[PDB]
Design a binder for this molecule. Structure first.
Ligand code: NA
Length: 129
């Protein structure tokens, strides 16, 4: 599924991401834009051989099981394929554990490089929330 901007904003809000760990909804929509372009089926291979899955590009190195990332963990206790679903529940549940891990949204390097400190409120501008 390719979400619309306000569509994803509404789905993240319903799943309790708005201001989760103090991160306004626009931070989460910004991160999704640059991680996945709002495509739930997005997958990208890392140099270390781990893969990033779904709207928030959650890494098989720690958070999900894909069966092909040696010495990795599955801290969200999910198959990585669950992060590609048109239903974002699994991605949002796992993102709550990642952002709780001590470094907030800096875990998403594209958030740090492209969203952090910017006018993230613009990402939810005009959305009926
Ligand atoms: Na893993």
């Amino acid at each position: 599924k390719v979400f619309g901007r306000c569509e994803l904003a509404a789905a993240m809000k319903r799943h309790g991401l708005d201001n989760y760990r103090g991160y306004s909804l626009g931070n989460w929509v910004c991160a999704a834009k640059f991680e996945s372009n709002f495509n739930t089926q997005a997958t990208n291979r890392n140099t270390d051989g781990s893969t990033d899955y779904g709207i928030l590009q959650i890494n098989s190195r720690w958070w999900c099981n894909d069966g092909r990332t040696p010495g990795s963990r599955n801290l969200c206790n999910i198959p990585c394929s669950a992060l590609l679903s048109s239903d974002i529940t699994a991605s949002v549940n796992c993102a709550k554990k990642i952002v709780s891990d001590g470094n907030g949204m800096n875990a998403w390097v594209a958030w740090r490089n492209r969203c952090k400190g910017t006018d993230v409120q613009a990402w939810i501008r005009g959305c009926r929330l």
